[PDB]
RNA sequence: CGCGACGGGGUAUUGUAAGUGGCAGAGUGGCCGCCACGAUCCACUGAGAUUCAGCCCUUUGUCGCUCCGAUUCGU
RNA sequence: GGCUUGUGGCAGCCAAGCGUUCAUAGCGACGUUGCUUUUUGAUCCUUCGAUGUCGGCUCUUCCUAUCAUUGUGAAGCAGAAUUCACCAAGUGUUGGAUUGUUCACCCACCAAUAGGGAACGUGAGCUGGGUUUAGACCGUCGUGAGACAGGUUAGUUUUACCCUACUGAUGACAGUGUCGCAAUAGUAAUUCAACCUAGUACGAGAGGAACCGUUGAUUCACACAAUUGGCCAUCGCGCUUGGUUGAAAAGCCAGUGGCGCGAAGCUACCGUGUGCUGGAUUAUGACUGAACGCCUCUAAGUCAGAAUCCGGGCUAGAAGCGA
RNA sequence: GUCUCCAAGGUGAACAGCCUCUGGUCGAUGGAACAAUGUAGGCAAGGGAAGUCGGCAAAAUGGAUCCGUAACUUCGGGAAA
């Protein structure tokens, strides 16, 4: 018979399976549509989440209860220090899909890229890319990668860059071993890609050529892990009456007799979290760029002389002091986990895409209690100098 | 202009809150919450701001045994300003409103809120302090 | 210059985009800086009986 | 070659440690102001304690370890 | 459950008449043709070396005979509201009083509070109020023992570790590692309000809209913890009862002695952020245009076109594959 | 499940509970982790029975001293109202 009333299922069943992801780093599934028309440029960035504050900004939303007042709202900091291009990669448009054509690497990697070839890189006797690395040191070699480099520009339609990111910078990930992906280039021929990714090659790309301030990005990720959990708190189900025998964190029916089988939209246990998931239309509030006064908390109604990092440092990740972002609202993972940066694929149209951003206040107490200093010394102070 | 953003909801169906006006009524019994659509087994809630239907119990007898709108002026659960500032006041209080919102009584005790001022202006101008 | 408001229990700077602030009955705003000041005067202590508190500071002259 | 164990600093929680002194202290008992008892109070003292165990920085400083091995894998 | 469909429910044909006029906007008397198995009967084919027998709760999926939402045709459609019909099951369909109820009835909210299936879905999922053992009371019946599709009150709800299904977890997938392609499967967003349009169109008046646009909200989904809130055996600090170590100091015991605060971690519409775009089409309205010298959206050939469909995006990634 | 004798100190009305002395004893197979579900024990913003057949369960009350104590009543009670 019929249910007795009617209540929305719980849960999403195009999140399925709810499995542990397999992979760590965020993994781009589209690159944002090509413009021929417009100079070549990358698609994507890596960074690495630090934590997170609140800042205080004066709304200019005409129509809106907000207008001319302000607003307190929660931001994620991103370190994103500059990645490395070393390497490019070409695909051919193929009946079954793009193909990879080939890859062409630089003639110096670095060793925190090289430790992502192993397993055990200190035990190794490091041999990775040492036999490629030679052919750039002869004539012929030369040819041979030029030549490679040329049937890119032949028969290659999407042309993609090697790029890793310089983990070392930041030592409170306590990893030495970089991360690695590919970045689609968009924008101009298929020969200028070439030589706009060959020119990159052992240089240094930093954020700002990538995003910018105001604009919506995509942050794609792997959700915090939390193990294996019951349906209650991994579906969403209500929990049953306080008389039930056996428990009551379940599912009372699984399912009718008929079909005779446990159909997959019925919420069961398991893993919950750790799953990779793609959010999209993440404003970009604030880019800090070392040696700049961006970099530091300051506002123009501000002028506290303070750094982003809140007194005690960021929690369980340190110090930021390479470039950074700051994106409204929350981010994906854990602190520490690396991130995946990627432009929308949607023509950003809506009044608070376009919106400007004017930041009042940035704050920069402790995250580690209920702080009350915005600087060291505002507390030495205040305790006398203690 | 704009609308009312969401606010901590802390007054659901059976709540019993004060009457804030002098119309003789001295509590308000919450039967239900215009606007809501609802969801399986979830009770109905409003606040600061939001009208309710109600009913009288405890009052003069010619209000007693009734039906009728009011409006929420006060509430305990904590919300969120805009500002990142949490507000709550040291009690729930309701008003006596007819169904254009026009107050019954003429007077208001004690603050009411500013979220209900601005969506209701003629309990606005009986009130004594806006915060 | 920003506009910071005061704890009115423990007389601490509160900046922008925290605080509790309790209204009570007699229109009275109160301003707290986190839930141990709330606590406190909620549960009717002194700030000039608690050591800590700027209250206390000044009437003893420390 | 950094790591690890101490320690220091940063950060945070509690709310002012123990000891010493007091012409603070409701009073009371002896002696010829002195002595004794006294919860509590004041000064040293936003003091002391705790703070990664899944917090941050780190030799000013101290100390240790930097690899005995084992199992497999071939176009 | 099966056959049957009298009965129950739903639908069509004829046109006497109703509808101020006017058979057919909307209705359909007298007759007559069907569908349905969400009613109840009829039967006794399966099960009596047992298929756990009411309802509710919980949870998923499915149907359309569409209550609301999207696009349209019709009207005795001025506007507003309402009614009839078409494509349409994508999304939603609630909080309560009384009753064990199914059913019903009322209060209230809402865009709407449509109807049903899945062994009258669902008891090794619960619950046990009812029914349906043994105790007991009443009424009626019986000489009596006792009886009552009459009322009443108390009355043990057992087992999964097997196979499969389902959920996740390793492994396998021909050296090892990195970066990738990708068949295929899953899939998601949703509805409302305010302001403006506008007291405008329309109308004698009463009354009284809509698209665009702007700002919010509901249901849902996926994350997240700067802030607020919650949780303490941080047994972190303080306070404190009884006992105890000759006192002080400092501790311990009372399975967490108790109390206040309590960072961290976890966590809440009790907190915060985010939630998407092309193509082909349905109904329907049209273009050109014959058959049929005219006419005709149709026959050949075309156009617009939706909460539709497919793709894209999002989740997974094959004894699939590349560099 | 099975009769009975002896019975310390403190707190307190008390062979109540809690702690201690004499005497007895650490006998219950151990180790490492800290998922779901469970059993036992807790707590919780705002609301306060809207849950459910039904306030089931839990919470709240609780000792002593002083004041004060209604209807009704068989005059005794009710009453720790
Ligand atoms: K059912
Ligand atoms: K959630
Ligand atoms: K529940
Ligand atoms: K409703
Ligand atoms: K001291
Ligand atoms: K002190
Ligand atoms: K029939
Ligand atoms: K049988
Ligand atoms: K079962
Ligand atoms: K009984
Ligand atoms: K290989
Ligand atoms: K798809
Ligand atoms: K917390
Ligand atoms: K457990
Ligand atoms: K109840
Ligand atoms: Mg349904
Ligand atoms: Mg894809
Ligand atoms: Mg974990
Ligand atoms: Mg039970
Ligand atoms: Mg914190
Ligand atoms: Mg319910
Ligand atoms: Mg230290
Ligand atoms: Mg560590
Ligand atoms: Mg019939
Ligand atoms: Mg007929
Ligand atoms: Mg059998
Ligand atoms: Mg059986
Ligand atoms: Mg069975
Ligand atoms: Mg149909
Ligand atoms: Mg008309
Ligand atoms: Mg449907
Ligand atoms: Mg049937
Ligand atoms: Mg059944
Ligand atoms: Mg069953
Ligand atoms: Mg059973
Ligand atoms: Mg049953
Ligand atoms: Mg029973
Ligand atoms: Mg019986
Ligand atoms: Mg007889
Ligand atoms: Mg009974
Ligand atoms: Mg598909
Ligand atoms: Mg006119
Ligand atoms: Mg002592
Ligand atoms: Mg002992
Ligand atoms: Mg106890
Ligand atoms: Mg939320
Ligand atoms: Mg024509
Ligand atoms: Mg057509
Ligand atoms: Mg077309
Ligand atoms: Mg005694
Ligand atoms: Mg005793
Ligand atoms: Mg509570
Ligand atoms: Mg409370
Ligand atoms: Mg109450
Ligand atoms: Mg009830
Ligand atoms: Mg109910
Ligand atoms: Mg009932
Ligand atoms: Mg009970
Ligand atoms: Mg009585």
Redesign the interface.
């Known amino acids: 018979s019929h249910r007795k009333?009617?209540?929305p299922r719980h849960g999403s069943l195009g999140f399925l399976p709810r499995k542990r992801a397999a992979r760590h780093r965020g993994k781009v599934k589209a690159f944002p549509k090509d413009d021929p028309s417009k100079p070549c440029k990358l698609t994507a960035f890596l960074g690495y989440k630090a934590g997170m504050t609140?800042?205080?900004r004066e709304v200019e939303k005409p129509?809106?209860?907000?207008?001319k007042?302000?607003?307190?709202e929660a931001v994620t900091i991103v370190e994103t220090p500059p990645m490395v291009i070393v390497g490019v990669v070409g695909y051919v448009k193929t009946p079954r899909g793009l193909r990879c054509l080939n890859t062409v690497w630089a003639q110096h990697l670095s060793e925190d890229i090289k430790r992502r070839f192993y397993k055990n890189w200190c035990k190794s006797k490091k041999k990775a890319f040492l036999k490629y690395s030679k052919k750039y040191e002869t004539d012929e070699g030369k040819k041979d990668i030029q030549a490679q480099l040329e049937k890119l520009k032949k028969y290659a339609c999407v042309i993609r860059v090697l790029a890793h990111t310089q983990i070392r910078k930041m030592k409170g990930l306590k990893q030495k071993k970089a991360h690695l992906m590919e970045i689609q280039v968009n924008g101009g021929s298929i020969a200028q890609k070439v030589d706009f990714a060959y020119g990159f090659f052992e240089k240094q790309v930093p954020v700002d050529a990538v995003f910018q301030k105001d604009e919506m990005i995509d942050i794609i990720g792997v959700t915090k892990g939390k193990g294996y959990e019951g349906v209650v708190t991994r579906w969403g189900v209500?929990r049953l009456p306080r008389k039930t025998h056996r428990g009551l964190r379940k599912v009372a029916c699984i399912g009718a007799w008929h079909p005779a089988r446990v159909s997959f939209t019925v919420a069961r246990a398991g893993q919950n979290g750790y799953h990779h998931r793609t959010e999209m239309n993440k404003k970009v509030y604030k880019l800090g760029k070392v040696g700049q006064e961006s970099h530091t908390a300051l506002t123009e109604?501000?002028?506290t002389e303070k750094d982003i990092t809140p007194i005690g440092g960021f929690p369980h990740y340190g110090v930021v002091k390479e470039d950074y972002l700051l994106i409204k609202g929350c981010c994906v993972g854990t602190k520490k986990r690396v991130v995946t940066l990627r432009q929308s694929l949607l023509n950003q149209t809506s009044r608070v895409a376009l919106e400007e951003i004017k930041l009042?206040?940035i704050?920069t107490?402790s995250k580690f209690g209920?702080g009350?200093f915005?600087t060291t010394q505002e507390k030495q102070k205040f305790y006398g100098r203690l | 202009?704009?609308?009312?953003?969401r606010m901590s909801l802390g007054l659901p169906v059976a709540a019993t809150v004060n009457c804030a006006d002098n119309t003789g009524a001295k509590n308000l019994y919450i039967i239900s919450v215009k606007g809501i659509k609802g969801?399986?087994?979830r009770l109905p809630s409003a606040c600061v701001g939001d009208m309710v239907m109600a009913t009288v119990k405890k009052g003069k007898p010619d209000l007693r045994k009734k039906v009728m709108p009011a409006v929420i002026v006060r509430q305990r659960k904590p919300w969120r300003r805009?500002?990142?500032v949490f507000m709550y006041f040291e009690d729930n209080a309701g008003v006596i409103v007819n169904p254009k919102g026009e107050m019954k009584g003429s007077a208001i005790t004690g603050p009411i809120g500013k979220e209900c001022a601005d969506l209701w202006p003629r309990i606005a101008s009986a009130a004594n302090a806006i915060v | 210059?920003?506009k910071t408001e005061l704890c009115r229990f423990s007389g601490?700077?509160?900046?922008?985009?925290?605080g509790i602030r309790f209204i009570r009955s007699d229109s009275q705003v109160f301003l707290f800086?986190?839930?141990?000041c709330k606590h406190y005067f909620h549960n009717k202590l002194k700030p000039s009986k608690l050591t800590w508190t700027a209250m206390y500071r000044k009437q003893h002259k420390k």
């Open positions: 009333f009617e209540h609140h800042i205080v129509g809106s209860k907000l207008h007042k302000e607003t307190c209500t109604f501000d002028r009042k206040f704050d107490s209920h009350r915005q | 202009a704009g609308n009312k953003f969801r399986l087994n805009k500002d990142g | 210059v920003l601490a700077k509160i900046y922008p985009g925290r800086v986190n839930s141990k």
